[PDB]
């Protein structure tokens, strides 16, 4: 959608959405980032 309006972009550019969705086909799974955060905390406190 960026290029299709002839904005200035390097042809075939990209980006990194840091997050995920919450509406995969209209079912709302549980926001995976929560898991990626929770296991991190868990591992770190186990280590400490």
């Amino acid at each position: 959608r960026a290029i299709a309006a002839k904005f200035p972009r390097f042809k075939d550019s990209a980006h990194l959405n840091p997050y995920s969705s919450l509406n995969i086909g209209g079912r709302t799974q549980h926001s995976v980032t929560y898991t990626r955060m929770y296991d991190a905390i868990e591992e770190m406190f186990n280590l400490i």
């Binding site: 995969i24 209209g26 990626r36």
Partner: protein, 132 residues
């Protein structure tokens, strides 16, 4: 190296192959201290995403020593009952194309076409030619 896509073309009516006895692998071990485990057969598209943590498969690639053999076996068995793919069987013969499926599982349903899959996984099935 590249385009090892070999038209494996498994058949939809046999995707319950999953419960295979620890799908054949290839172990190796050298002084690089790697623990390399190649995957033989139709399973070179599976990528242990940031899921599967705390599964045995992860915690073994920290074992510094030489890797025992039975560990590979029972850990693979413990892993295979977690892994899954989307499919639907219907009347007639159909091939599965085994690629978009593995992919939309390889990345856990985050790119647009995965929405076309998770919501309706018949489009993965296809007849004689042109799975796309």
């Amino acid at each position: 190296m590249i385009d090892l896509r070999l038209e494996e073309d498994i058949l939809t009516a046999t995707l319950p192959e999953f419960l295979s006895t620890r799908p054949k692998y290839r172990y190796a071990y050298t002084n690089t201290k790697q623990q390399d485990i190649r995957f033989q057969g139709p399973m070179r598209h599976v990528r242990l995403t940031h899921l599967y943590k705390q599964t045995k498969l992860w915690n073994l690639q920290y074992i510094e020593r030489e890797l025992a053999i039975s560990e590979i076996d029972d850990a693979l068995d413990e892993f295979i009952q977690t892994f899954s793919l989307p499919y639907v069987i219907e009347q007639g013969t159909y091939k599965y194309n085994m690629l978009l499926g593995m992919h939309a599982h390889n990345v856990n349903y985050q790119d647009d076409v995965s929405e076309l899959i998770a919501n309706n996984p018949q489009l993965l099935n296809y007849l004689d030619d042109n799975p796309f």
